[PDB]
Design a protein around this ligand. Structure first.
Ligand SMILES: CC(=O)NC[C@@H]1CCN(c2c(Cl)cnc3[nH]c(-c4cn(C)nc4C)nc23)C1
Length: 254
């Protein structure tokens, strides 16, 4: 199905980035509500990201899972490239995080469960996300989690969510998402990433040395899971099944 801009009525902007803006939109005939990502070919070309975008589309349009944001298709005109995406009605976990400041163990463990399932699927098709962060986590009509960017994803910057093996330029596989999963679990419970610093160069040393601390209110069950996920040695990180059956997950998820 080849598309065109004239098929859509454009609504409010949902996000304004440098690559481009994403708007609420409605296809005219079906009256289908969706999200339309508008990128500038010029702004694209001048950065040479024209490659992985094609890889982003190629990968995302093939993935079908309830916890992964769906890509319906795309098209381009004379001057722009448009990405037609599933619309997540409840916004980002990011905004949810800065409203509620922190999450309870129930909401946290539920997000981790949904995330692990989405990743397990992604890993089954040997796709790693690499850029798993709260602003890439969207929420569905039931408040379910939906992973939602793949513009820096491939087959097997901002340091906060990256693993030591990735920042130290080394070799990396599916185990990098397990690290990110731990960073998120911490952030969900605490309100900020475990390795947050005021400089890039300092966040680098925190990650490279695995230097994080727990505030008093983090329970042992959560401290244990996080400590298992945040291992410098990728091989020592738990499999997704082991995360899904962790006592603290089992006790608090839904
Ligand atoms: C920082 C930031 O905005 N990140 C999100 C990107 C922008 C829109 N994106 C969306 C995409 Cl790609 C799809 N659906 C969305 N729904 C929303 C939204 C935001 N609010 C406050 N309420 C709703 C509903 N956003 C999107 C991705």
């Amino acid at each position: 199905r080849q598309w065109a801009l004239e098929d859509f009525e454009i609504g409010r902007p949902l996000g304004k980035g440098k690559f481009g803006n994403v708007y609420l939109a409605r296809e005219k005939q079906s009256k289908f509500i969706l999200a339309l990502k508008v990128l500038f070919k010029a702004q694209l070309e001048k950065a040479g990201v024209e490659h992985q975008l094609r890889r982003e589309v190629e990968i995302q349009s093939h993935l079908r899972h309830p916890n992964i944001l769906r890509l319906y298709g795309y098209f381009h005109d004379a001057t722009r490239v448009y990405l037609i995406l599933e619309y997540a009605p409840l916004g980002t976990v990011y905004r949810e995080l800065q409203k509620l400041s922190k999450f309870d163990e129930q909401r946290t463990a539920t997000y981790i469960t949904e995330l692990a399932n989405a990743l397990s699927y992604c890993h089954s098709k040997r796709v790693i996300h690499r850029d798993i962060k709260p602003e890439n986590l969207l929420l569905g009509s039931a408040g379910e989690l939906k992973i939602a960017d793949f513009g820096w994803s491939v087959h097997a910057g901002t340091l906060d969510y990256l693993p030591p093996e990735m920042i130290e330029g080394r070799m990396h596989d599916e185990k990098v998402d397990l690290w990110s999963l731990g960073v998120l679990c911490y952030e969900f419970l605490v309100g900020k990433p475990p390795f947050e610093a005021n400089t890039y160069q300092e966040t680098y040393k925190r990650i490279s040395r695995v230097e994080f601390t727990f505030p008093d209110f983090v329970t042992e069950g959560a401290r244990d899971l996080i400590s298992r996920l945040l291992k410098h040695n990728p091989s020592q990180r738990p499999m997704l099944r082991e995360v899904l059956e962790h006592p603290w997950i089992t006790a608090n998820s839904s």
